[PDB]
Amino acid sequence: VAESWCYTQIKVVKFSYMWTINNFSFCREKMGEVIKSSTFSSGANDKLKWCLRVNPKGLDEESKDYLSLYLLLVSCPKSEVRAKFKFSILNAKGEETKAMESQRAYRFVQGKDWGFKKFIRRDFLLDEANGLLPDDKLTLFCEVSVVQDSVNISGQNTMNMVKVPECRLADELGGLWENSRFTDCCLCVAGQEFQAHKAILAARSPVFSAMFEHEMEESKKNRVEINDVEPEVFKEMMCFIYTGKAPNLDKMADDLLAAADKYALERLKVMCEDALCSNLSVENAAEILILADLHSADQLKTQAVDFINYHASDVLETSGWKSMVVSHPHLVAEAYRSLASAQC
Amino acid sequence: ESWCYTQIKVVKFSYMWTINNFSFCREKMGEVIKSSTFSSGANDKLKWCLRVNPKGLDEESKDYLSLYLLLVSCPKSEVRAKFKFSILNAKGEETKAMESQRAYRFVQGKDWGFKKFIRRDFLLDEANGLLPDDKLTLFCEVSVVQDSVNISGQNTMNMVKVPECRLADELGGLWENSRFTDCCLCVAGQEFQAHKAILAARSPVFSAMFEHEMEESKKNRVEINDVEPEVFKEMMCFIYTGKAPNLDKMADDLLAAADKYALERLKVMCEDALCSNLSVENAAEILILADLHSADQLKTQAVDFINYHASDVLETSGWKSMVVSHPHLVAEAYRSLASAQCPFL
């Protein structure tokens, strides 16, 4: 259509960081006394490593009541990266109030430091009315807008007279679930029949595959007793194994998490954790944490521990956390180790 | 997300010095009184002291009292420290004592402070409340900050992340491991192993012969001649891995195999690969191949190409060969040209 298909797209690598300057009022390192920061990367590969360079009274004798803020790029692969940086003035509630942004995009190379002379006023920082030093602690927010800005597309704008169906590996196999043909044997669980065959589970489930050849299929292929789960969970297990997807996730995650942990289905376990991660709440933390511990869903243990760290003020007095305390010592011990050693 | 932390360790401690009979403490003329050392805060690491000159060591100190602080011991030559002193608020006095407006480096065996504080008679004046029981009580605050270590924090935590999909992963592993060798197919000498359900699902034509209750005998002596073993290996690779990297130079045989097995997607991708294969010299060959394989899309593309390049396509002898061999193609082409070109004589 219209011959060309000009669709030049701008790639924006946006990512933010917040600062925590401890009792900056009497830190008092002036006139070139170097101060650095913790280096950070965008996360998508480790290419940019930055470090802060700030003089409370900016270098040279002209910025007496003013700060010289500078971002220094320690090193990056030679690509002539162009990026934009912005900051602001912070308040008690951790929200930017006075925000100043770079007028243009600066060309970044290794050893090149970019910044604004006279970034912010010293007395305004020290102005008690502005409230920029809550409990004498100064903080700052930095939002990056690194742009690669390198994409070339030529052609094709094909008319595409015919439509090509995608690969039908899933629906062809999954659609055989309800129809239930070519099933060599039967399968009943919890006294309920879900008719299915074993070879496909062998191909699609290593646990059964190893456990298949070990002296069951010779005799007990017709009937295998599975009682860890319920039929409503086993049907979703079978649908996920066949198709690879389980849209019915949230309402029955934890039981299916146990089902996955039985067979070590890693994708299934992590999608259970996804379903549970968004369900984190003050009254739900304890049961989620013991659930993660019991099935060794390590990540969900980590997020639940961090949620307990950030909501110890109220989760402690919930009945759930008292149940966790009285029932399990080691869980409280681990939460304590993670909240004292790591935070503190 | 940084939580940059950037902790600065600052140690504040105090040492309350009180003297009896302060009126008599001007005893050793302009010289100095040596106090008792002390340590506190960080596990008594540092020893500190201070001394007072009630009468001036030098001429300038004769005017005002000089309480000039001394360092006893320190592990490092550089010790950035703040010093502030005042009275211990017997009556109301939290003022009248100066402050150190700048942080000075403290080094082993060295002393630092100031000397111009208050007149001696004014100090001894009880009207200022500076002789409680002929005693002077001091409120010194020493704040020593160690240059920052302790930067970092990171805060690199975005959701929970997901490992890659295992749908295609399990296909490749079972093929390479050569496990569950449930059948052996001998075709063109070469031996090929595979499973039943996957072959039945992907190829309905394979399932059709095996759906008639005779599979145990058919698998052992499966008759496969129409498709060469290399194309069979390519078909297995496409089914399991999901890719056909070498499809460009073997599209035609793979296309015929897809036609035989009714693999619609395989036929479509073979046609797409062959779509970017037309040239001025073999256009007739691609056209007749598409017509033989009932490739409607490729046939229409070849017809459009011929309509575009008739100024040169008809020059080649392939057109005459097609005319002589298959006249009905010429008949329908003439019908299409006449029907399309309604105007003109």
Q: How far is B104 from chain A (nearest CA, A)?
A: 11
Beta bridge partners of A189: A192
Question: Read out DSSP for B268-326?
Answer: HHHHHHHHTT--SSSHHHHHHHHHHTT-HHHHHHHHHHHHHSHHHHTTSHHHHHHHHH-
Cα separation, A278 vs A258, in Å, equals 18
Mutate: best of A14, A24, A37, partner B, most B CBs <10 A: A37
Are residues B75 and B183 part of one domain? no
CA torsion A228-A233-A239-A240 (nearest 10°) is: -80
CB-based contact A299 B160, cutoff 8 Å: yes
Assess whether A126 and A220 both reside in one domain. Answer: no
Q: Are residues A121 and A206 in the same domain?
A: no
Give the domain CATH number at A198. 3.30.710.10
Chain A with chain B: Cβ pairs closer than 8 A: 128
Minimum CA–CA partner of B268 in chain A? A164
Beta bridge partners of A42: none
Q: How far apart are CA B17 and CA B39, in angstroms?
A: 14
Same domain, B192 and B126: no
Shared domain check, B173 and B104 = no
Q: How was this model experimentally determined?
A: cryo-EM
Å from B2 to nearest chain A CA?
A: 5
**Nearest CB neighbour to A38, from listed B2, B157, B300:** B2
> Same domain, yes or no, for B170 and B62?
no
Partner-chain residue, chosen from B151, B170, B171, that has the shortest CB–CB distance to A37: B151
A173: closest chain B residue by CA: B201
Task: Say yes or no for a CB contact (<8 Å) between A40 and B2.
Answer: yes
Which class for A304: exposed (0-12), middle (13-18), buried (19 or more C-beta within 10 A)?
buried
Q: By residue range, what is the domain housing residue A86?
A: 15-146
Q: B98: Cβ–Cβ under 8 A, 6 or more apart, which residues?
A: B114, B117
Question: Could you give the CA distance from residue B47 to residue B37 in angstroms, rounded to a whole number?
Answer: 6
Q: For residue B144, which residues of chain A lie inside 8 Å, CB to CB?
A: none
d(CA B231, CA B202): 16
What is the number of alpha carbons within 13 Å of residue A69 lying toward its C-beta?
Answer: 17
The vertex-B148 CA angle with B144 and B153, nearest 5°, equals 135
Same domain, B78 and B201: no
When CB atoms are compared, the residue of B80, B157, B160 closest to A273 is: B160
Full DSSP string of A215-252: TTTTTTTS-----SS-HHHHHHHHHHHHHS--S--GGG
Distance CA B255, CA B258 (A): 5
Task: Evaluate the CA torsion angle A269, A273, A275, A281 in order and state its sign.
Answer: positive
Q: Do A209 and B180 touch (CB under 8 A)?
A: yes
A119 with A179, same domain? no
Q: Do residue B123 and residue B235 come from a single domain? A: no
Cα separations (Å) of A28 from A32, A69, B215?
Answer: 12, 16, 87
Give the chain A residue whose CA is nearest to the CA of B8. Answer: A22
CATH number for the domain spanning B77: value is 2.60.210.10
Cβ-Cβ contacts under 8 Å for B121 (sequence gap 6 or more): none
Indicate yes or no: CB of B4 within 8 angstroms of CB of A35.
Answer: no
Distance CA B45, CA B11 (A): 11
Report the alpha-carbon distance of residue A221 to residue A128 in Å, rounded.
79
Which candidate from A17, A22, A265 shows the least CB-CB separation from B7? A22
Phi-psi region of B155 (alpha: psi -120 to 50; beta: other; left: phi over 0): left
Q: CB B166 to CB A38 under 8 A?
A: no
If asked whether residues A35 and A96 sit together in one domain, one would say yes
**Are the beta carbons of A19 and B2 separated by less than 8 Å?**
yes
**Chain B residues near residue A305 by CB distance under 8 angstroms:** none
Do both A19 and A142 map to the same domain?
yes
Residue B186 sits in the same domain as residue B251: yes
